[PDB]
Structure formats: structure tokens, C-alpha cells
């Protein structure tokens, strides 16, 4: 379904700032953006809400919906399942809002194979040391999950240098600066949606 404005795919390693930046964008520009609410089998973190951050489901329920053809894409990431349901994107497109998706690098490649034609943005830390610091400060994951996330970060940061893969790469050193660069990448779309 190609409906409405060009969607936005935001990716980057675990801990890079994706959710922090997207929450800011949806607060400032609530009238023109809508968030695709993915399914995940991971457990919710304090403050996360079902139907807002994710649909938190069991492996059994997610497998039922996968088998029925309910997903545009799905991926295994650091021991859990994640995916973008068809209805998650339809809900935002039906409101004629810019659909924002937060997905991993596998999801980026999955979406490249669809008809969605998004802009692809990668948010990256200044270094893997800083990434680990931010992840361990958050400490919402077990040690095993952190190890998996740090390994995925190193692999996916190298893979994201692929030419033509990402339209924009933003280094999240300072959040205020990264957020301005996020809006810069979307500035013409934001202006059109306001008109």
C-alpha cells in the first residue's frame, strides 16, 4: 500500500537513541507523524505500554499471526522476535500521516523489498564504548542480552556504511543536535505535510 506521504524508516544499533528521538518527534509533530506499533516477544520495560511502544505478545501468538500472513516483515534480534504488522502501517496511512518505523538492519533490508518507498535514516552512537555506556546505564536487559546487542551493534554499524543503504546517517552525540538533524532530513516532507 502506497498511501499518503513517504514513510520514514529509522534504524541503528541498540542503545543508539532511536526511541528517544522518535518520542521527541511525535511530541512536537503529533499532527503529521504516526508511529508504526511493532509486535515483539520481548518483555516490556518500565514505562512501556502495550499498543503504544509495541504490541507485547507471546511467541505462540506472534507465530499464529505470522502464519496467517499478518506481517509485512519480521526479524529475530538478540534472542527475541520483532515485526511490522500490515495493520500497524495501515492504521497510520489511513490517517494520512507520515508513518515512522523503528526497525533493525534486517528490517531495513526487508522493507527495501516492499513497495513502501521510505527514506532510510540510521542513528548511530559516537563509538561502541559510548554505546555500551548508554546501554549499561539503562540496564533494562540481562547481561546475555547486552552481549548480544553489543555484537549486533558492531556488525550492523559496519554494514550500515553500505552505499545507498541509508539516505542519512546521524551521529547521536548530543540529543538536541541529533534531533535537529532528524528534522533536517525530513524538513521538506514536514513542510509539505503542514500544507
Ligand X SMILES: Nc1nc2c(ncn2[C@@H]2O[C@H](COP(=O)(O)O)[C@@H](O)[C@H]2O)c(=O)[nH]1
Ligand Y SMILES: Nc1ncnc2c1ncn2[C@@H]1O[C@H](COP(=O)(O)OP(=O)(O)O)[C@@H](O)[C@H]1O
Give the footprint of ligand X on this chain (CB under 6 A): 14, 18, 38, 42, 73, 75, 77, 82-84, 102-104, 106-107
Residue from 18, 42, 74, 97 in contact with ligand ALF (CB under 6 A): 18
How many CA within 13 A on the CB side of residue 174? 4
Residue 58, annotated as binding a ligand = no
Tell me if residue 6 is catalytic.
Answer: no
**Is beta strand 80-85 parallel, antiparallel or unpaired with respect to 39-40?**
antiparallel
DSSP state of 79: T
Whether the Cβ atoms of residue 1 and residue 89 lie closer than 8 Å to each other: yes
User: Rounded to the nearest whole angstrom, what is the least distance from the CB of residue 167 to ligand ALF in the complex?
Assistant: 20
User: Rounded to the nearest whole angstrom, what is the least distance from the CB of residue 178 to ligand X in the complex?
Assistant: 16
DSSP codes joined into one string, 129-192: HHHHHHHHHH--S-HHHHHHHHHHHHHHHHHTTSTTT-SEEEE-SSHHHHHHHHHHHTHHHHHH
Residue 138, annotated as binding a ligand = yes
Residue 158, annotated as binding a ligand = no
Tell me if residue 64 is catalytic.
Answer: no
* Position 172 contacts ligand Y (CB under 6 A): yes
User: Rounded to the nearest whole angstrom, what is the least distance from the CB of residue 34 to ligand X in the complex?
Assistant: 15
In the annotated binding site, the residues are 15-20, 38-52, 138, 172-173
Q: Which residues are documented as binding site for ATP?
A: 15-20, 138, 172-173
Q: What residues are labeled active site?
A: 45, 138, 149
Binding-site residue numbers for substrate are: 38-52
Residues that bind ligand Y (CB under 6 A): 12, 14-20, 134, 137-138, 172, 174-175
Amino acid at each position: 500500500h502506497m498511501s499518503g506521504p513517504r514513510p520514514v524508516v529509522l534504524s541503528g544499533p541498540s542503545g543508539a537513541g532511536k526511541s528517544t528521538l522518535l518520542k521527541r518527534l511525535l511530541q512536537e509533530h503529533s499532527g503529521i507523524f504516526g508511529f508504526s506499533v511493532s509486535h515483539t516477544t520481548r518483555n516490556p520495560r518500565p514505562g512501556e505500554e502495550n499498543g503504544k511502544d509495541y504490541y507485547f505478545v507471546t511467541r505462540e501468538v506472534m507465530q499464529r499471526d505470522i502464519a496467517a500472513g499478518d506481517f509485512i516483515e519480521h526479524a529475530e534480534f538478540s534472542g527475541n522476535l520483532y515485526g511490522t504488522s500490515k495493520v500497524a502501517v495501515q492504521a497510520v496511512q489511513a490517517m494520512n500521516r507520515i508513518c515512522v518505523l523503528d526497525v533493525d538492519l534486517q528490517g531495513v533490508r526487508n522493507i527495501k523489498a516492499t513497495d513502501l518507498r521510505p527514506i532510510y535514516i540510521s542513528v548511530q552512537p559516537p563509538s561502541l564504548h559510548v554505546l555500551e555506556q548508554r546501554l549499561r546505564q539503562r540496564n533494562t536487559e540481562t547481561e546475555e542480552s547486552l552481549v548480544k546487542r553489543l555484537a549486533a551493534a558492531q556488525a550492523d554499524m559496519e554494514s550500515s556504511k553500505e552505499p545507498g543503504l541509508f539516505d542519512v546517517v546521524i551521529i547521536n552525540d548530543s540529543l538536541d543536535q541529533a534531533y535537529a538533524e532528524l528534522k533536517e532530513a525530513l524538513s521538506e516532507e514536514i513542510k509539505k505535510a503542514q500544507r
